[PDB]
């Protein structure tokens, strides 16, 4: 689990848990203060127990190698804006299905919104997770046009 | 021991040592380059050995939960200003009595002074120590009015 | 190995390897995405294997502050590499421990906008014993070109 913080934002890029290791998963998330989990890949576990513990789970899958749709980006930035404002010091977790995968992508988008160029966001994440992004992802982050509407 | 660095500032939030483990405590502080220790809670150990090693100890206790008095904040900001300037690359350690406690509060104040909003300071610290601040502390950091007089 | 990242820059301050542990060395560098190695002290190992793996090795040996030419070459490398290879890493090492390896990294950070004290703290946060007195003194007198754009 890699943790990245920038302005009033703090993210936890985690691994996909299993219905079996769900209790320990929830236990850790709670300690990190995560209030929301965004699943950007296959949904592999039941979220009733997670939701019961006060952790809302959002399923926003986006085709691998494929860039997240504009709507996902807008929904993500909207989530970042409200959560870190209404719940000061909280954390948003994001995960894919087998290893970091494309989970780091949305985090990078949040950092770019925070004022970083995509290269900076990539380095900032890699400093925490050496193998963070793959070639295809770097190429589309290079073409990403930020809205730059978040205020800090 | 959590370490936080921002502009020309570097802080070490440590645990309260004992007269018995004082030697190892001093040994570590020296390696971190700390030149000053600020005790914000109960004074539990003799400081002669610490002072002899070139580490000045300051006792600035501030009430149960209660926000630090304006004078403590001014004294703290004055210490931050001169130490990191007169001793480039040094470190200021801060500790309470049983765990982190109120020790991260002053560090947050220094970060805010450095340009961060309190939420950013809280996240910046939490990235290093997950359970950093409690509800009461977050509430008064929210009401804290920085002087914003330190120059960088 | 300490890793420092600031703007579009990411550096790996490593230890001097041996011809014997060269394979594992290369394996790690590749995982960190390093494309270049700058050796600022004695050259102790053969670089054919390293160069073959796509990692260019530069010998810029320089106590004595790095010469203006070394600084210019270093800043030129920082400018082009992080631009032409987004997200890459530049490794730097001396001969026996951190040594003088951190100096050039500090210079890159100052170029990035940090005052030398900030650069020193930024590095020490990663490596407690980073710089020695002599080095702090000359970093204090260092006059940055401040020409790098971000």
Curated annotation (Swiss-Prot), chains A, B:
Domain Tyrosine-protein phosphatase: 1-152
Domain of life: Eukaryota
Catalytic activity: O-phospho-L-tyrosyl-[protein] + H2O = L-tyrosyl-[protein] + phosphate
One example of a Gene Ontology biological process annotation: positive regulation of cell migration
Entry keyword set: Cell cycle, Cell membrane, Cytoplasm, Cytoskeleton, Developmental protein, Disulfide bond, Endoplasmic reticulum, Endosome, Hydrolase, Lipoprotein, Membrane, Methylation, Nucleus, Prenylation, Protein phosphatase
Recorded GO MF terms: protein tyrosine phosphatase activity
GO cellular component: cytoplasm; cytoplasmic side of plasma membrane; early endosome; endoplasmic reticulum; nucleus; spindle
Description of post-translational modifications: Farnesylated. Farnesylation is required for membrane targeting.
Tissue specificity note: Brain (neurons and oligodendrocytes), skeletal muscle, regenerating liver, tumor cell lines. Expressed in enterocytes of the small intestine villi and colonic surface, zymogen cells of the stomach, proximal tubule cells of the kidney, bronchiolar epithelium, but not in esophagus and heart (at protein level).
Region (Interaction with ATF5): 89-124
EC number: 3.1.3.48
Task performed by this protein: Protein tyrosine phosphatase which stimulates progression from G1 into S phase during mitosis. May play a role in the development and maintenance of differentiating epithelial tissues.
Name of the protein: Protein tyrosine phosphatase type IVA 1
From Swiss-Prot, chain C:
One Gene Ontology biological process: positive regulation of cell migration
Pfam families: Tc-R-P (PF22785)
EC number: 3.1.3.48
EC class (word): hydrolase
Effect recorded for residue 94 to S: Abolishes enzymatic activity
Enzyme active site: 94 (phosphocysteine intermediate)
Major location category of this protein: membrane
Tissue-wise expression: Brain (neurons and oligodendrocytes), skeletal muscle, regenerating liver, tumor cell lines. Expressed in enterocytes of the small intestine villi and colonic surface, zymogen cells of the stomach, proximal tubule cells of the kidney, bronchiolar epithelium, but not in esophagus and heart (at protein level).
Positions that bind substrate: 100
Protein name: Protein tyrosine phosphatase type IVA 1
Species the sequence originates in: Rattus norvegicus
